[PDB]
Design a protein around this ligand. Sequence first.
Ligand code: HEC
Ligand code: HEC
Ligand code: HEC
Ligand code: HEC
Ligand code: HEC
Ligand code: HEC
Ligand code: HEC
Ligand code: HEC
Ligand code: HEC
Ligand code: HEC
Ligand code: HEC
Ligand code: HEC
Ligand code: HEC
Ligand SMILES: [Ca+2]
Ligand SMILES: [Ca+2]
Ligand SMILES: [Ca+2]
Lengths: 495, 495, 495
Amino acid sequence: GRETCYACHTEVKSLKENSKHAAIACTVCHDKTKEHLEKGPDVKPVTKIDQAVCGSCHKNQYESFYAVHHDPTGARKEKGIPAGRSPLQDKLLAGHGFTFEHAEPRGHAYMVVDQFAVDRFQGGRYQFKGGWKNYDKVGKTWDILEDRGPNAKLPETAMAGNPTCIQCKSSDLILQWKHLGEKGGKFDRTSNVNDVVKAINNPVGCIHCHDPHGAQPRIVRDGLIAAIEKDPAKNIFAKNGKTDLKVIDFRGFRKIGVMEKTDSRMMCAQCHVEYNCNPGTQRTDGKPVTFADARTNHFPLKNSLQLLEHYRSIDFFDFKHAVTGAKLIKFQHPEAETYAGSAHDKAGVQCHQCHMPQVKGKDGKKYSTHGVVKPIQMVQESCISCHKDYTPNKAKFMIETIRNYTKGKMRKSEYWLAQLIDTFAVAQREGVSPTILDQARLKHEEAHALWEYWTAENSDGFHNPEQARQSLTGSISASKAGVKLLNDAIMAVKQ
Amino acid sequence: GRETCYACHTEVKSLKENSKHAAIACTVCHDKTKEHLEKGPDVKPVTKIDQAVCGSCHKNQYESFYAVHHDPTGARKEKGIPAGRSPLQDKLLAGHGFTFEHAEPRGHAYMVVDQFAVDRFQGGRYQFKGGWKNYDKVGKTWDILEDRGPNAKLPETAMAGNPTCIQCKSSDLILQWKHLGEKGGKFDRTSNVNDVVKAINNPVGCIHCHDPHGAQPRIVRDGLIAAIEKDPAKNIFAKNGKTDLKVIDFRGFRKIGVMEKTDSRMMCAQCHVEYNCNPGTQRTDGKPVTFADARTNHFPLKNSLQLLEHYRSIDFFDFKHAVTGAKLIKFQHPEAETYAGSAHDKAGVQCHQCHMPQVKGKDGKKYSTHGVVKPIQMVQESCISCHKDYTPNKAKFMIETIRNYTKGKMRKSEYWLAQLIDTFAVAQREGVSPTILDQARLKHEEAHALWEYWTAENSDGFHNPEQARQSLTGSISASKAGVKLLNDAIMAVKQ
Amino acid sequence: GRETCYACHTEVKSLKENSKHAAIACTVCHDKTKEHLEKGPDVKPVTKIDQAVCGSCHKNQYESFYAVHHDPTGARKEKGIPAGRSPLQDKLLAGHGFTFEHAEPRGHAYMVVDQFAVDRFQGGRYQFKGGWKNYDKVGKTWDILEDRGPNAKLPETAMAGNPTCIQCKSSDLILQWKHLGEKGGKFDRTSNVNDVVKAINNPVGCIHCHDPHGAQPRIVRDGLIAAIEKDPAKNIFAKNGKTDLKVIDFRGFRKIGVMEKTDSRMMCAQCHVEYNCNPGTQRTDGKPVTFADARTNHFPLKNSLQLLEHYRSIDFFDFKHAVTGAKLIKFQHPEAETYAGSAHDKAGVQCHQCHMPQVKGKDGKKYSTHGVVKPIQMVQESCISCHKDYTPNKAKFMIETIRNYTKGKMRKSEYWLAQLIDTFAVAQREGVSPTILDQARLKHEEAHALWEYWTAENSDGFHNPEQARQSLTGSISASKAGVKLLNDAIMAVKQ
Ligand code: HEC
Ligand code: HEC
Ligand code: HEC
Ligand code: HEC
Ligand code: HEC
Ligand code: HEC
Ligand code: HEC
Ligand code: HEC
Ligand code: HEC
Ligand code: HEC
Ligand code: HEC
Ligand code: HEC
Ligand code: HEC
Ligand SMILES: [Ca+2]
Ligand SMILES: [Ca+2]
Ligand SMILES: [Ca+2]
């Protein structure tokens, strides 16, 4: 029937004919095609967004994504603890919902459960069925979780969860979400998150990185496309004033991004970026900033050195610091804007060679693992595959040495930000001029922007050790200047 | 010629005849039996309370108890280090003798030696003979420790040691201590602790948990007996409006509580509980609770959510905080009260099944290891014995995720207690008043009770993950309210 | 024929003649001798300071010195991080150059390159050629390091570097440096540090500890030799009111001291000591002590309990604490003075017995490893080799128990110092008399000297657990007494 179909659907024809899924019948993935043909457009075929469908001919990539492993140091690692990645989180994000719960990332099959379950998502509404003994279960979101209802309370929770959230945890809304979550789809940015979640059965789909119609490498994330289109020539994935991406737009409803070849920097940047997906405040005007605003589904693709002036180049911030009152950027996982322009990036290395390395599955067949690898934990396949002369110790030595040097500056950045913050509050009480407290607000704004980036970022400098050193020394520098002048004012008050 | 004795010791007759300890001559465990008959009861037989008699017949329980293990991470682990179980100890407990030293617990054979030598015990009077190189020595207290004498001074120590303290470190005084440490025996609660220590040759006797005459499961601790006797139907060890304790009293002098079935929850709540074995202060009068008072040898047998009310009820608190003056409860190792009502306790699982798992000896009869275990360190016997589907990685994952989540809240609640103490110092200097300060001081009590319980308790929430989260979020919420009504009042002044 | 040489070089003959080296011709280690012979004394021979030559007949000492090792925890471990050796470094050293960077030690082969590349040396001017990927490279300094230039800057760096630093990283200047760096040689204390770094291709040479001429155990370190000569009956290496060491003063220009027997406390003592090698400030007048003053190249040879007196007595302190203006001593790695009169010292054990344990070559010859060892990593032959009853884990438990107890005190000293500095600052800002801030400042001095000795020393109390206890408790005491004088003096103002 395929020629019948292609009559009103030529983008699928253009993707699929002469592709590597050429021979796959429209019926392996779309149900009720007959009722579509026989009573027309009105009756849509059913497209069950499902890794198992891809799995039936790609068992390795399917079983590797779903394999359960137990890190014996456990999961749900709060960042905010003394020996954690963000030891002065509570002080430095005072005001922000990340103060309720922010844990370290774990495996991809858990991304839906984990966002819905975290204390900051929806007031603790959603919970693991059977609780802790079932924290390692993978598969279907609502086989794993229960919903204790709209009116349930859990103490020391928050209500950060929103529709745009879901776009970096599932390919489930790919046909039910119009571009940037403007209206006209099943869901949009203004939708109740508690409607949206019951539609989310799967983590990141096979379809997120790989065209089902043609097996092309690709991207579906709306905000990323918006960003690769705002800057096709000078964006972090660009080359020669051009990017290996061509947008296909359906009905003016949705868009995909076929790259002529693999750039896992782009597949991975669909979620491993800094992003605004939340309500905010305006810098100029002080007005709230709403889900009706398209800055609430937004990929800046700026690094640590650029992000402050970007969020000023859009009169956008996330939150006032509960003490200093400074208009702060909330930073999240910028692995893409970090990795950009680094040693490995420069050398043509992409996320997949370190994070999805080659393994012998089947009975003796080669593939890329789709359970993403933590490389310190797999130096032979993550590092020595390329660095042929490296011993496991040397590989580990390198990752940890860079981590050590970076974390040293991260930790000092925090010492100074804590010092600014406390110094600010002493200034206020010693009555210090409110004109100056502004000046200091800008210094906390700067010092925070060049620090929080790196706790938000997951590599402790490995992804870009020069950018991390220039950033974090930047932060230390802004805080000392900020504490200097506050301290200067607090003697002048008394002079 | 037992019936001769039985003629006169009838409670002993009842425990011993038809029992597993039927055939044992009285002489085996008592000496001087002739002068007692021949001279009369003025001349008491000697009762050398000693593991090694039990060891003659029970070698695998004796060996495993005294077996010397070295953990390569060491012990004398101070809980008030940055990466410790209680990193904010010195600040949250200020005024408390625990600020002098509080280590993590080690194995049961060290318990007298570590009680005697701790910096908080008796001004450093008692030290390991030959110093650090003998810190792993097991055996008789005074073979291991030396007495520096009463006039020895050692910097930065405390004098928390009293008689009652020994009641959770050894069986040696079982016949030298009237019920509750009331005046009557060789030692009471008013005895000089320096006379008491010379009488303690062994750690916890075999007879602590086991009747010497018939071998029936028992408790000997006068606190634990007393608590249960009080709350006979509803206490944390009950089932169906009663408790499994057959309570035998000897000469109206002392008592054992005997059980038809092994209940290790009770066997361990002889020591692993919250207690008061110390002087304190009445909440109403400000005046002393000396060792005169029965509240200085007291088991609440209540959990985190009940203890502030319990001790409020019996007009008792432990120390004013050094900054805030809050009438605080000092919390100690409430494992039995935390475990009460958890998923494992509801399964009917007891302390012993995780902490004394089935092992085999030289020949290989199956014994319960009396070298108690750290389950994370032996997940095959402690976990996988019962959870048959768990791998070691799985068992480790289940322990550490739960400790991870719980620790995240413990660290957050310590951040909020320190902020609460810090803003109180400020509110004093900012001239807010006894009324606003007495209310904030009330928020310190509550959030101290709902936190310290958990640094006191040794599971980091494994024993009761739901209780922990309820309590620690409660603590956070209380500190948050406290801080709210300080900084508010701090503006009320200068407005 | 070496007899010509000897006629004008008396003291070389006396070292070489009838030694294990005697037969080795002068031309093995000296070029331009035929030129020296003909063209007079005006043509000084070439003697290249070069481990390769010592190497040629001392294979296994050489190869072990240069052997690549990769610690899987990496290197460049900042000490001022929460989990780290000196968590409160940034607060307690506020106003000293170590706040810019201070990492744990690695291998000797790295000593010059880490000295010149550390952020606190010369404004980030020296960096690894090819960056992090070459950070494990050994051998020649200017093979591994690039000079970025005098004009270049790197943010948040310091300029602590000076020629005297090089005396504890290299032997290369043993024929180029007046005794103690006084004026006369190609390099002296007043030299531009960047001229001196050009001359240093090698770390500590074989000649640091072994006489090239007759292979006698010696020290070549000017300021140690000077320390001893000054206090020859009562210094730390003395027995019987005599040190084992004849000082040989060649041309009145350069001293060495030769050993009758191997004393590694002395040899290792050439670097593993507290020193002054930096400008500071006289206490009596507050006047600078510049490189003109011989106190800028100075070995006290005093333990934690003597240094405060010592620096008062020679009228000198390094820096003012940024907050308290306390006249603070900067401590560095006081290892041999820590070790002096410890249980191991008094038992005649030497540094080399633990740190250069016997291992054997491939050819199968036994030797002392010159890749200096971290005992916890290698207890088999740093410990068990002497303590044969010791299991691997007992050796670890022993090291780690001592470290555990000491760091418990160390962190408490740090908590109380931070309390003192936050109280000194409150106290100031509530306007307590300068006389009573002066009282506070002396306690800060005393607290400080008793605490920072142990963060700079490398063992966390293992080397001398008794001295560490008595010093750190002395610190806590000094701090608490300060905190009390400030809180009482605070209440006095507003009385
Ligand atoms: C023109 C006469 C069509 C033929 C022949 C087929 N399809 Fe179709 N399809 C068509 C329209 C005009 C629309 C949607 C627009 C509307 O408002 O009705 C569709 C929709 C689909 C979809 C769903 C997309 C979504 O929003 O979820 C699918 C998966 C689809 N069609 C598949 C399909 C197949 C497999 C066909 C051959 C058997 C086929 N279509 C025929 C128009 C026409
Ligand atoms: C959005 C749909 C994502 C895409 C595309 C990718 N990742 Fe991701 N990743 C995401 C989440 C939400 C999480 C955490 C899940 C949780 O429940 O906590 C992750 C996790 C990783 C990790 C950690 C791996 C582990 O701990 O077991 C790595 C190393 C990681 N992600 C890397 C990665 C790479 C290299 C990608 C391109 C191939 C990639 N991810 C895609 C969200 C999303
Ligand atoms: C090899 C040169 C790498 C490339 C290319 C990328 N990453 Fe990485 N990443 C690498 C290391 C050595 C580490 C340290 C942590 C570790 O496990 O060893 C990281 C860290 C991450 C993380 C944190 C989780 C983890 O894997 O431990 C994430 C989520 C991650 N990296 C993602 C990521 C993405 C999206 C990349 C392309 C932009 C990327 N990494 C590149 C090694 C390498
Ligand atoms: C060891 C295996 C024992 C044998 C055999 C017997 N007894 Fe014992 N007895 C033993 C201990 C360790 C103790 C101390 C207290 C305790 O409850 O554990 C005792 C105590 C007694 C007492 C004191 C009872 C009282 O009034 O307090 C009596 C009167 C006594 N034991 C008597 C007794 C008789 C008559 C025995 C032979 C029939 C006998 N014991 C055997 C340990 C052991
Ligand atoms: C008082 C007599 C006790 C009774 C009854 C029990 N325990 Fe205990 N325990 C006690 C002390 C004083 C210590 C610390 C000893 C020290 O010197 O530090 C402990 C320790 C434990 C530990 C930790 C063991 C380790 O090697 O670290 C566990 C796991 C433990 N105790 C468990 C336990 C159980 C399960 C009991 C009933 C079965 C029990 N204890 C009884 C004091 C006393
Ligand atoms: C309480 C903290 C205990 C102390 C002190 C000692 N034992 Fe024990 N023992 C205890 C429990 C909870 C159990 C399990 C009982 C069950 O229901 O399975 C045991 C068990 C024994 C046994 C029976 C066989 C076995 O399980 O190993 C014997 C023979 C035994 N214990 C002897 C013994 C001796 C000689 C002791 C002193 C060194 C000793 N026990 C101490 C609890 C406690
Ligand atoms: C398995 C279901 C358990 C039962 C039943 C009990 N405990 Fe436990 N305990 C358990 C874990 C997994 C841990 C954490 C630390 C570890 O070693 O894994 C603990 C911890 C303790 C400690 C701290 C010492 C330690 O082992 O690290 C003590 C002193 C302790 N537990 C006592 C205890 C008592 C008295 C119990 C019955 C009320 C009890 N535990 C039950 C696992 C389990
Ligand atoms: C049988 C003797 C058990 C031993 C020993 C341990 N566990 Fe267990 N556990 C068991 C039962 C019957 C239950 C009730 C729920 C169920 O699985 O049917 C549990 C519960 C847990 C849970 C959930 C805990 C909770 O608070 O909800 C976990 C995570 C768990 N068990 C793990 C575990 C580990 C790691 C153990 C060794 C330290 C362990 N258990 C001992 C049965 C038994
Ligand atoms: C290498 C094993 C050597 C051999 C063989 C000889 N010399 Fe040497 N010499 C050597 C070094 C590394 C140095 C630097 C100083 C030090 O003590 O380590 C020296 C120094 C001299 C000097 C200068 C001494 C002074 O005046 O301060 C002289 C005059 C000297 N050496 C002479 C000498 C002669 C005559 C030898 C053959 C009999 C001879 N040296 C052998 C290294 C080595
Ligand atoms: C012989 C050359 C030794 C080497 C190598 C090490 N130790 Fe030692 N130790 C030794 C002696 C002769 C003594 C004195 C005690 C005696 O009876 O002679 C010691 C002392 C210790 C101690 C007690 C330490 C104290 O501070 O008093 C411990 C805990 C100890 N030693 C452990 C130890 C470890 C772990 C070693 C490797 C790092 C080690 N020692 C080396 C003899 C020798
Ligand atoms: C008749 C009356 C007898 C007989 C035949 C025996 N005992 Fe005793 N015994 C008796 C009294 C009045 C007391 C004193 C109680 C007190 O002073 O508090 C005792 C004491 C003991 C004890 C001492 C308990 C303790 O250690 O303080 C023991 C262990 C004891 N008796 C044992 C014992 C045995 C083994 C007998 C048969 C050989 C025996 N008694 C006979 C009274 C009487
Ligand atoms: C008589 C005069 C002689 C003879 C026969 C030799 N030397 Fe050698 N030497 C001599 C003097 C006066 C000096 C010093 C020059 C000065 O003081 O400025 C030296 C110097 C050396 C050195 C270098 C020391 C340094 O760098 O500071 C070496 C290594 C040395 N002399 C070696 C040497 C050898 C091997 C000889 C026999 C071939 C020899 N000298 C002969 C004076 C005299
Ligand atoms: C300072 C300390 C050092 C330096 C810089 C070098 N060595 Fe080595 N050396 C040292 C000690 C304390 C010892 C042990 C001596 C003893 O136990 O009494 C040694 C030992 C040697 C030996 C003898 C063989 C052995 O015991 O291993 C040789 C041949 C030796 N040392 C040579 C040597 C070389 C060639 C060096 C430069 C690579 C070198 N040492 C450095 C102390 C020190
Ligand atoms: Ca953001
Ligand atoms: Ca208590
Ligand atoms: Ca110094």
